[PDB]
Design an enzyme around this catalytic site. Structure first.
Site, mmCIF file in Angstrom:
data_model
loop_
_atom_site.group_PDB
_atom_site.id
_atom_site.type_symbol
_atom_site.label_atom_id
_atom_site.label_comp_id
_atom_site.label_asym_id
_atom_site.label_seq_id
_atom_site.Cartn_x
_atom_site.Cartn_y
_atom_site.Cartn_z
ATOM 1 N N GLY J 50 -10.978 -4.710 2.004
ATOM 2 C CA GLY J 50 -11.485 -5.915 2.628
ATOM 3 C C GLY J 50 -10.514 -7.070 2.691
ATOM 4 O O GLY J 50 -9.290 -6.884 2.691
ATOM 5 N N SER J 79 -6.894 -0.702 0.577
ATOM 6 C CA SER J 79 -6.760 -2.131 0.839
ATOM 7 C C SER J 79 -6.890 -2.889 -0.508
ATOM 8 O O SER J 79 -6.315 -2.479 -1.490
ATOM 9 C CB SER J 79 -7.857 -2.546 1.844
ATOM 10 O OG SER J 79 -7.785 -3.901 2.219
ATOM 11 N N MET J 80 -7.660 -3.975 -0.555
ATOM 12 C CA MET J 80 -7.783 -4.767 -1.773
ATOM 13 C C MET J 80 -8.429 -4.014 -2.935
ATOM 14 O O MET J 80 -8.354 -4.442 -4.093
ATOM 15 C CB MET J 80 -8.551 -6.057 -1.498
ATOM 16 C CG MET J 80 -7.878 -6.931 -0.461
ATOM 17 S SD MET J 80 -6.186 -7.398 -0.976
ATOM 18 C CE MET J 80 -6.518 -8.319 -2.483
ATOM 19 N N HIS J 104 -2.463 0.584 2.022
ATOM 20 C CA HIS J 104 -2.393 -0.103 3.314
ATOM 21 C C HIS J 104 -3.310 -1.336 3.298
ATOM 22 O O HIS J 104 -4.513 -1.241 3.021
ATOM 23 C CB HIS J 104 -2.819 0.855 4.436
ATOM 24 C CG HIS J 104 -2.744 0.252 5.803
ATOM 25 N ND1 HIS J 104 -1.922 -0.803 6.096
ATOM 26 C CD2 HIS J 104 -3.396 0.564 6.949
ATOM 27 C CE1 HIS J 104 -2.073 -1.133 7.372
ATOM 28 N NE2 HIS J 104 -2.953 -0.314 7.909
ATOM 29 N N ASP J 140 -0.228 3.426 7.157
ATOM 30 C CA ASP J 140 -1.522 4.010 6.913
ATOM 31 C C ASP J 140 -1.279 5.362 6.265
ATOM 32 O O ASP J 140 -0.842 6.308 6.923
ATOM 33 C CB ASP J 140 -2.243 4.211 8.259
ATOM 34 C CG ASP J 140 -3.719 3.832 8.203
ATOM 35 O OD1 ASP J 140 -4.202 3.464 7.098
ATOM 36 O OD2 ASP J 140 -4.402 3.911 9.261
#
Lengths: 161, 162, 162, 161, 162, 161, 160, 162, 160, 160, 162, 161
Positions: J50, J79-80, J104, J140
């Site tokens: 996010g 992600s996060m 990523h 990615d």
């Protein structure tokens, strides 16, 4: 549909009267008066009534335009619906045999309403031939009139059979 | 669609009768009487019925206009639906062989309701040529009539057969 | 769309039958009969069936109008959908090779349902050729008929092929 | 709340009768009969009525359990509501002075309903003392009874003042 | 509420049977069996029935747990409702005098259903005392049986009377 | 839109097949056959597939009508989508180079067994594969490229540039 | 309710498996393992199955924690539901007589293929079926009775 | 909250009166009479009023139970709200200095409505010690009374002042 | 409106690409090709991109029909939007000075298949060696219109 | 439920990270640190990731409080989510055998700021040279648990 | 929450005033007065104001109960919110330094509104010290008073500071 | 949850500030001050900011109550969020290393002008910057890092490890 009716100069007032309806009815009146100032208009009324401010707008538009406005009560004319019925062109105010009429009418706008109500009562006295005090008592009370009771109170000129 | 029907002077009353429906039906009646005052109208009725006030409005509009209104019962005419069926033009009130009629009749003014009710019974008596006390008995209770019992009772003039 | 179909005198009955659908179908039938009383109508049926009262309304309207109504089963005709299929014009009742027919028949009054079932049963007997009592058993039972079985029983007149 | 009422062995039947309500009422009855088989139950009834199948379920549960079930009509008991009122323990069937009672009662389930209706009529004849034919006419017609008319038809034993 | 009932070891099966209901009923059964393995359970049944897969889950859980499960039909037990009724602990299967039983049974492989239908007819045969082939004959058509007829038929042990 | 396509005798089957879609497609087919019985129809298929009953309805309507029905697979034809593709007019069954075909096929249980057999048969006939292999391949997950669909005899031609 | 069940160390997996369900089930597993690491857990399964990624999460949590997880099929275990059934503690994997088992199972594509391979391998070890046999049977539509599920190696004991 | 109030035997009637509200109020009354039959109940009323049938239900429950019911008007008591205010225990009917009372009174049974209406006028006459013809005049029309006019008319016993 | 556009043979692809959009676009393409096979089509593209399967369907329809399809990037062409831009008729692929292009692309087995086809086609449209395409599709980068021209994704920038 | 988890000092981060989730997680962290500053916290992570701003808020709260925060990846940390996994207490960062990690990462000016901070922190947590981090954050790719251990994102895989 | 506040005898009036809010506030007031008639109540007010009829209900309940009601304006007190502020216990009416007060006052009957405005105006005059006619002008006009202006006018007793 | 936080005297201001939030925050502040007037309160702030009227209500309640209010910026304090941060108890105003502060501030128009001036003043007083510069910086978009917020005198301390 009512579009087709419109071409025959018939307006149908079929609902409670609010601003919307009042705008709509005024529009149609002004429109017809635009097409043919000389020619009669038929307003059919089946309405529980509604806001005195909305009602007075229609009434004013009726008095204002050139065409004579005949009124016909079908199911019911109560509150401002009964008032508009009574405000039809003289000798042109009609009801069907089973229709009913109730002249009963329900901040700092308050002062304004009290004034409009006074005007309303007076117009009704004139149109019915009743004394103002009688109109006052009867619009403050819950009462129903048959086509026949309304003919004989002066709200309509003719029962159409 | 019913628009196309309208051009042929057919009105379909296919639902319970309330103010909306009553306004609609009245409008269509007034419209057709406007086009052609001289010419007949066909009112097809399949309805469970509804409010006596809304019904009387349609009834009055029917009596009032120039065009004769033929009534045809298709599935069912109950309550104010049966009343309107019965109030069709004389000799023009029709049912289909399997259709059913129920004359049983089930906001404002209790006193008005009572008055309308006396007149509804009265109009039924004239139109069916029936004794008031009988009309009063059968509107008060659950009863259904076949196309045959309707005709014999005087609710319709004739049954349309293949 | 359906509208385009309508100009070709094709009515599509593609859903369960309730009052709405019944009104719709009745209207379209009355409409077409209005345009051209002399000319045939094609009713395509793919329906799980539905209310007997709604079904009988469509049936009565079919029998009533002048145009002959050909019936064509496409996926399925069950309940009142199989009844309407069977009620098509004689020699004009059709099915597709893989279509299925189930004559099983499952707001209202009980004696009225019973009256209408006897009637629908009788009609079916006339149309199929079957004895009333054979119909009575088969409507109370869960069975499917292949198109060939259907044609044999008297429900249809012809199966549609290469 | 009605929870607190429950501890006092009061059931409130306050709505149209469907399966839900019927399940609920049956549950409460069975529950109370569970706690104290020997001890009386009070069923208050204000209901427009409902499904004969749902109604018969409650009635059967009433007849079945050990506790005597007193019935009290408050606003209205119509259709299966009137039936349940009438089916209360004898001498325990009560109405309030202004309450009203209407015994009027509204595929292939059809056969079943006709049978249940027959049972219903018969029970009502027994409980009221009316002849079956009288019960038949009156449940097929729209009629209203005052507490007093219902006392004197045999639907209730006492008007509670 | 039902929660209070639960403390008294009463489960109410008051609706059509689907996976949700089946999950709920299984949970309650496992829960009660957890509290007191030795002690009886009362399952009240008023149900139109439902999915055979969902039904068989409840049945298996019933057979599986230690507590004896008494079944009581209240308004109606149809389809899997009637099956569960019949699958109650022997001598503990009960109906109310006016209740009704219908043993007719109408994302899942067709063969899965075919097999589960057979296995149902067999369980039901052993529970009634009726011969397989008569049960097979009966459940493939609509009937409805009164409390008296279901008593006779071996579906229930006792009617709740007086 | 689609409406414009319709005037050119193109039907787009762009979604899962249920009764609605099946009705729609049948209607369009009947409609076109009504306008011009002699003239060809182009059915473009990008569909995940769906109910065998809904599928067989379309298939029957295809075999029944006079117009030849050319089938063109665009993204995907799976389940009854693949079946309809295969059931196009012979030599008129087409795919795009990157499109995919999966013949895997996942109320009367007895009846769905019948249609399933009938499906498998029609498939054997049109592909000219052993009914033996058709039963393997429709009972398992398999994706064919446009070439792999050519060899199987599911399509006659791959459309290029 | 299932709260009361929880106190008895019973988890009910009664629905399709998605991330929500997977999170829930994982949480309950971690919670029970937290209370009493030494003590057994009962996982009841009636599920149409679901996402392989959500399934593998529950499976990993099962393998990871100390408590042995017994698995019980009630109505149905299909897809990842059948997988989790098969992945129960050995000799503790149970079905009811009438229950059914079906082992049929950017955009994360290379990973789906890995997880799938990993799932086929785990079912091989656990059923005792050859891989080639599992690869066949998870690509095709078939159902097994309690009995057939016992025979294939998917459960240890049919319960009555 | 009103739960806490309930423990102190205070019921708040704060809305239009319909069947729901009437059921609620009746329940609370029966509940309190259950706890402690001997002990007084306080009914606070701020209501625009409502259905005569729903109102009579509350009124009957009030008359019926053992506990005396004191009534207190807060903002407004109109229609059946004013009637219930007037029907409080004698000497226990209260208003606040700025509160207003309107005795004007505006599905089934027209005849019932008329009957209830005669009795409503009658009960008002007893409780206000007023002539029937007067009660009839003032229930028929729009009129509002201050706390002072209410008291003098006999609608309440006393006005509570700081 | 876009109806009026349609009569001028302009298709607007203004949103994420899913099956719905893909069906729509394919339909419009087939329609126009039906009216006038000989005559050019203008496809304007402002799209965040979307599903590779939905994209490839539009692409195939483009390659398949007779009319040449000119592509014009307006705000953005990312993912399959960038791919369709690049797949426009040669010499007819256009972008506006401030527009942006991102070639990053977000049955598994079939997905991995299309992904390879996609890289190859791009490699052919841009003249870029395949292995450069594969790096750039895996990674998140924007190209200014200028960069996209030089990369061989678009033929001309619109200006002046 | 997670309430019961909370009493055991387990926080479940089970969803995409937005402000709501970030507020929630921060609150729970502050709460636990309030009860018992001395005592460890377990943060389980299955998240698609996010917003970088919402993420950095959780990260800062983690670094700020006294309790050590152990991180455990269950299905996925992208992600996060991957970033918070990597930011767990050293030696306490864990993954399950089948879990996956994607580093990523999908006021602009402040966004570009946090992005740099993020790369640096990762570089410090993994021991990877910064410039490798920057390549891998832009692109990615999924890491298997095994790959993430070797990369220095997690300390231990849970097994056995 | 608010619930916790309630245990400390703090009521928060944080919204426009309608019948709902008025009922709520009245209830809480009656509740607290029930718990402890002797003990003070704190009413915090941040409100745009609202219906005069709803406002007067809260006011009457305030005057009526035994506990003294301190009023504290936080963001804003306008219309009936400024009226309630002004109606707090004497010497107990408070505002925050940056809060604002607007005494402007904008289902129902017209004569009732007018009666209630005169009354609300009189009350305000008593409480503020102002002449009735000063109040009349200021309620018909759009003005805001700073806390200091407010304290000077007589609307509050004290401003809350370091 | 938050409820547990409340028992520890922590308030979380995690959203845009409107009347609702402002009411909530005021309530919590009044509540805590009620429980323990002597004891410190921790207000954590991650907020995009919001209405100046709603903001000033919280600020007033802060200055008014007895308990000292420590402020901690977590993600962001902008608009009235930054203002409340700055208005924490002196030496008690904290930020996290990566948090951001933006003092930019975007019905009685005459009144909002008054509050705006009053805001700017309080800001000048607490930061000790020229009222001159406070008017520049609140009228334009500017983001301060935790260090930049230290120099400005918006926070006393940056919290680390």
């Amino acid at each position: 549909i009512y579009s087709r009716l419109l071409k025959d100069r018939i307006i149908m007032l079929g609902s409670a009267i609010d601003d919307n309806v009042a705008n709509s009815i005024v529009s149609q009146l002004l429109f017809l008066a635009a097409e043919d100032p000389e020619k009669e208009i038929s307003l059919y009324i089946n309405s529980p009534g509604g806001s005195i401010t909305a009602g007075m707008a229609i009434y004013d538009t009726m008095q204002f335009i050139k065409p004579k406005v005949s009124t016909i009560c079908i199911g019911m004319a109560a509150s401002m619906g009964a008032f508009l019925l009574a405000a039809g062109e003289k000798g042109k105010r009609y009801a069907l045999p089973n229709s009913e009429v109730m002249i009963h009418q329900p901040e700092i706008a308050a002062k304004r309403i009290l004034l409009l109500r006074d005007k309303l009562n007076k117009v009704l006295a004139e149109r019915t031939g009743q004394p103002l005090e009688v109109i006052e008592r009867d619009t403050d009370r819950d009462n129903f009139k048959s086509a026949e009771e309304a003919l004989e109170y002066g709200l309509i000129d003719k029962i159409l059979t």
